[PDB]
Design an enzyme around this catalytic site. Structure first.
Site, PDB file in Angstrom:
ATOM      1  CG  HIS A 121      -1.664   1.309   1.211  1.00 52.55           C
ATOM      2  ND1 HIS A 121      -1.706   2.581   1.749  1.00 52.55           N
ATOM      3  CD2 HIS A 121      -3.501   0.674   1.240  1.00 52.55           C
ATOM      4  CE1 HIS A 121      -2.870   2.438   1.302  1.00 52.55           C
ATOM      5  NE2 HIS A 121      -3.485   1.883   1.033  1.00 52.55           N
ATOM      6  CG  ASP A 198       0.529  -1.483   5.703  1.00 49.64           C
ATOM      7  OD1 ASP A 198      -0.337  -1.332   6.870  1.00 49.64           O
ATOM      8  OD2 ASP A 198       0.230  -1.141   5.128  1.00 49.64           O
ATOM      9  CD  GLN A 201      -7.825  -5.319   4.711  1.00 48.61           C
ATOM     10  OE1 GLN A 201      -8.972  -5.845   5.312  1.00 48.61           O
ATOM     11  NE2 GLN A 201      -7.190  -4.020   4.419  1.00 48.61           N
ATOM     12  CE  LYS A 224      -7.560  -1.629   5.365  1.00 50.49           C
ATOM     13  NZ  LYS A 224      -8.260  -2.932   6.266  1.00 50.49           N
ATOM     14  CB  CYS A 361      -3.743   3.006  -1.696  1.00 50.41           C
ATOM     15  SG  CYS A 361      -4.832   4.443  -1.957  1.00 50.41           S
TER      16      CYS A 361
HETATM   17  C1  LIG Z   1      -3.506  -2.975   4.063  1.00 48.77           C
HETATM   18  C2  LIG Z   1      -3.090  -1.779   4.212  1.00 48.77           C
HETATM   19  N1  LIG Z   1      -2.436  -0.770   4.502  1.00 48.77           N
HETATM   20  C3  LIG Z   1      -1.921   0.674   4.859  1.00 48.77           C
HETATM   21  C4  LIG Z   1      -4.011   1.320   4.814  1.00 48.77           C
HETATM   22  C5  LIG Z   1      -3.327   2.976   5.322  1.00 48.77           C
HETATM   23  O1  LIG Z   1      -4.830   2.923   5.931  1.00 48.77           O
HETATM   24  P1  LIG Z   1      -5.305   4.452   6.411  1.00 48.77           P
HETATM   25  O2  LIG Z   1      -5.527   4.944   5.351  1.00 48.77           O
HETATM   26  O3  LIG Z   1      -6.119   4.035   7.813  1.00 48.77           O
HETATM   27  O4  LIG Z   1      -4.401   5.597   7.492  1.00 48.77           O
HETATM   28  C6  LIG Z   1      -5.016   0.626   3.960  1.00 48.77           C
HETATM   29  C7  LIG Z   1      -5.753   1.416   4.118  1.00 48.77           C
HETATM   30  N2  LIG Z   1      -7.396   0.834   4.076  1.00 48.77           N
HETATM   31  C8  LIG Z   1      -4.523  -0.591   4.053  1.00 48.77           C
HETATM   32  O5  LIG Z   1      -5.520  -1.633   4.124  1.00 48.77           O
END
Ligand SMILES: Cc1ncc(COP(=O)(O)O)c(CN)c1O
Ligand SMILES: Cc1ncc(COP(=O)(O)O)c(CN)c1O
Lengths: 411, 411
Positions: A121, A198, A201, A224, A361
């Site tokens: 991401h 990260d 998910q 999430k 993204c």
């Molecule tokens: C796997 C993953 N990592 C990072 C992010 C970024 O998260 P946030 O928009 O809550 O900062 C997301 C957003 N869904 C995501 O799915």
């Protein structure tokens, strides 16, 4: 695990869109929230809202206990050793940025390597690109196998004695792969690097045990996992966080402030400048209590069931490509051959079905898959097999509808 | 302006603490929230929560319209020219930090001056201390007059041709002074500097017109003005924000992402990395609608009434020192001669009265006043003259109680 009983707890699901029952399959973008969470926020604003950490008046004390209590719930939830390792942030993105600013930008010299992967991401790409540009270090990518997983051999190959950081996703929002975080931590540590996970998910979907994973840093997002919008967590190993400078400065994180120089609080307050995200943090506490009552392993099992069912039913449709491996978290990314994913998603919405279409993204990963965009559907603890049936039926119908219009225009 | 009707809108006020009616006089730490705000958040999580800016499905569209609609409400509220000038942040502290990182740290060389004042909240001190340390610029403080106001002559004296930034509070959380922002902007601009206004304490209490003030940057916090916790705004002049690099990087703020380099969105999205604070921003919209319905001038007039009434009744008590000028926003900072302010506040809480005791995140200002701590009371649109009566009675009683114990121990 009773899905009827769980669905009764989510008000938002009981509605129609465009004349059809809502079918929400967009949890990988954002999850929905049960009564327990929403009513936690209501109770906060209706009864005990105040600034925290002063404790001189009753409400302020209640608020403080709610906020620090939530910190302890987060600690038990990911099995960190101490609350000093649990920092509240705006979300995963901000968390990753704190690490990149306060860790990477203070400890990278020319010579140094930061290794990411192609399946990341953007939150786990752009901060590192910027750290290496600011420090004249270099960025390396671990390549992917044919099924979009990562081999430990490629990992051993990419990380060298010059690697300072390895940054990787626990679970990919696009391929649904679950990365082998624990072994990758051992590899990184053998080369004298830290690992940043990260965990946006993974955290909503499976037991997280940062002591078992042995990661150095781990980031997650409330929205999430049934939590309020606007809040996230940074976990970091106490010894690393002790040596990092704060990312932002102001009230709450200082001890003594002179005209020119200032000293910092102890962890975790050292990293929380300003009035903290009080209500969102307490709500996130509530979300954690909710998921722990269902059981994270139960949730995980449910997601296994739905994902297996979805892969089978997708394989029954002609002219659909699914990306990613067989073994996966509860999401499917896909394309209809010959229909653009935006069109798929808009037609699906006319049937009450919410899915995501776009780059997710993950533009480098889109290039690697050799596509501009994809459609994606994600399951969560409120989703059922019936919902996947409605999705596959609507995709069948969409195939027929586009083909029909094509043939009609052809004549 | 009917105060009974307004108080009926705040559930939290209808409760007792320690057997007495709650009397909340801590709005300068955090304000309380009306039904309209709380029910806005409930409606969001119960009906239309989704990720924003994709618009391919119904809920996502509703969410987007709520979020960007809130941006427009903020724009009209402070009279900015464009939504591109309105950035949502975590709060005033984060806003000020963004300016210090992305503006100050990219445009300060040795030679350059940053001028703050002694009456500043820490959010408006520590970021500048750190910017000057990182860039080898120098920090100067505009001195205060005897009554804790600022003279324009001292301003003309402190800012020179080498000044790049002047950073000042619209309204002081401690002295209640209202600074002459408009004239200070003209002075700063004459010397080729930008002005950054900390508008945390002004925005809830009086009409803000950034075109009239002519400030370059202006920061405010939702929780101080009836809004959700966790959210704030940065206003900046479009031409300055166009030339600033983002403070944080990730999804949402990028346009094209390559392996090594990336391009940014247009304003305002350039400055919003990650899933934004959706619900808090929409709630802040609701707070703005609420205050605009009462009228900011009405609120201002109310606050004038309460502050004048409080200064009169404080002057009727022996052995109390009040800090700050006669002309002021709706707060009083004070000490009982011979009683420590923490003790005052705890005794006041036993009577149901919530006030603040401590350094007020203004340690340099505490040193200037020649004290370690003070007690502070703050009024807002839900406060009445009756509440100030209860405060002055309880302070009288506290004087008697401490004196009695002293005399008793003396025998
Ligand atoms: C796997 C993953 N990592 C990072 C992010 C970024 O998260 P946030 O928009 O809550 O900062 C997301 C957003 N869904 C995501 O799915
Ligand atoms: C005048 C002033 N400036 C700045 C701040 C910092 O605001 P926040 O904690 O919302 O970031 C405060 C906090 N009450 C304040 O009163």
């Amino acid at each position: 695990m009773n899905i009827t009983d769980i669905r009764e707890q989510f008000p938002i699901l009981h509605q129609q869109v465009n004349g059809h029952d809502l079918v929400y399959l967009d949890s990988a973008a954002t999850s929905q929230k049960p009564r327990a969470v929403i009513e936690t926020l209501d109770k906060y604003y209706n009864q005990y809202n105040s600034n925290v950490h002063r404790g001189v008046h009753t409400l302020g004390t209640r608020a403080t206990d709610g906020y620090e209590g939530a910190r302890e719930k987060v600690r038990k939830f990911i099995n960190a050793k101490s609350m000093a390792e649990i920092i509240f942030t705006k979300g995963t993105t901000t968390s990753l940025n704190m690490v990149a600013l306060s860790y990477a930008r203070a400890n990278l010299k020319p010579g140094d390597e930061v290794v990411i992967t192609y399946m990341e991401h953007h939150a786990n790409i752009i901060p590192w690109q910027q750290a290496v540009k600011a420090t004249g270090a270099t960025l390396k990518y671990i390549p992917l196998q044919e099924d979009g997983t990562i081999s430990l051999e490629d990992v051993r190959e990419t990380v060298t004695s010059n690697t300072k950081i390895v940054a990787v996703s626990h679970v990919s929002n696009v391929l649904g792969t679950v990365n082998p975080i624990k072994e990758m931590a051992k590899i990184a540590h053998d080369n004298g690097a830290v690992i940043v996970v990260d965990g946006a998910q993974s955290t909503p979907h499976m037991k997280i045990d940062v002591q078992d994973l042995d990661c150095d840093f781990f980031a997650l997002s409330s929205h999430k996992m049934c939590g309020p919008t606007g809040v996230g967590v940074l976990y970091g190993k106490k010894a690393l966080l002790e040596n990092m400078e704060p990312a932002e400065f102001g009230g709450e994180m200082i001890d003594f402030v002179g005209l020119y120089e200032s000293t910092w609080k102890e962890l975790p307050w050292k990293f929380e400048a300003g009035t903290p995200i009080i209500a969102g943090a307490i709500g996130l506490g509530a979300a954690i209590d909710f998921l722990e009552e269902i059981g994270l392993d139960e949730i995980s099992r449910h997601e296994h069931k739905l994902a297996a069912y979805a892969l089978e039913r997708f394989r029954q449709l002609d002219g659909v490509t699914v990306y990613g491996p067989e073994e996966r978290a509860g999401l499917v990314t896909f394309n209809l051959d010959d229909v653009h994913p935006h069109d798929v998603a808009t037609v699906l919405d006319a049937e009450g079905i919410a899915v995501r279409a776009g780059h997710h993204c993950a533009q480098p990963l889109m290039k690697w898959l050799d596509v501009t965009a994809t459609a994606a559907a994600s399951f969560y603890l409120y989703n059922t097999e019936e919902e996947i049936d409605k999705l596959v039926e609507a995709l069948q119908k969409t195939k027929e509808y586009f083909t029909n219009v094509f043939v009609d225009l052809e004549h």
